[PDB]
Design a protein around this nucleic acid. Structure first.
Ligand code: ZN
Ligand code: ZN
Ligand code: ZN
Ligand code: ZN
Lengths: 136, 136
RNA sequence: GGGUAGUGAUUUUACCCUGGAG
RNA sequence: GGGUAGUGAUUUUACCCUGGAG
């Protein structure tokens, strides 16, 4: 078992340095409490243009053991959609509701309809009017 | 001499409390060193909708002696244009270049052409690429 | 993403609305 | 107001462009 599936949120990310850590709250479908940190490098972020993650954004990902710890292979939003990125990202506040794509909107989305995800942090467990992250 | 003309910048303003102070750097056209604080109440701000000032924005105003100190009567931006207001003000970042009105833009502005004022703080002494306030 | 306001004398504001739709 | 990017292992980023025009 070399390639594992993980889900969580971004713990922290430094845009300039190009890396940070994910907080894995579920490993291969099983809930982790406490969560386990997974290293993330910008090169592995599923996004349009310049890559970064914002603290607290919901992620789904594949990872592996590395000499330095746990390393993520590909990092997406829940259900394989794109990541949100840094609050300072250009066009970062005009994403399609379905995929997170900066190019269009949900009425023009040709991808299959996705489960509703938080307008602020992409969580599939809550909605923006109840977003613990936005409440900061 | 009851009504005086003054000019300066906003020292501070608390939007919830509805008051703050102006740093008067010129009284009746004559430069002051040190500047003198002038009280300002939201009721006296020349602006469209909910009133507030942001720290550092350039003002012109009329003022008078009050029991508590100096009180401003009317507060405008340089040359009688509208104030900028709190950074959090709805539509606050989409003002006409000539008057600062929220309703339109410089092409459709019918007021006489005004001296060029900073895009960030409305100063008539500098431009945005050299703004000491934005440089914070 | 969007909205509303009002403690008058020295320091940076409080609410609200938003889920098959912008 | 707008743009560009790239230090791989534990903490929130660096530049730039913009003045009779958006
Ligand atoms: Zn889409
Ligand atoms: Zn959320
Ligand atoms: Zn105008
Ligand atoms: Zn300025």
């Amino acid at each position: 078992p070399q390639l594992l599936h993980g889900a969580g949120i971004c713990k922290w990310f430094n845009v300039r340095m190009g890396f940070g850590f994910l907080s894995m709250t579920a490993r291969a479908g099983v809930a982790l409490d406490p969560p386990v940190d997974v290293f993330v490098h910008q090169s592995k972020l599923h996004m349009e243009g310049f890559r970064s993650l914002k603290e607290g954004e919901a992620v789904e990902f594949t990872f592996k053991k590395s000499a330095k710890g746990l390393e993520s292979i590909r990092v997406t939003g829940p259900g394989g959609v794109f990541c949100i990125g840094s609050e300072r990202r250009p066009k970062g506040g005009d994403r399609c509701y379905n995929c997170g794509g900066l190019d269009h909107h949900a009425k023009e989305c040709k991808l299959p309809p996705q489960p509703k995800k938080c307008h602020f942090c992409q969580s599939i467990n809550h909605m923006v009017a109840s977003c613990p992250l936005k409440a900061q």
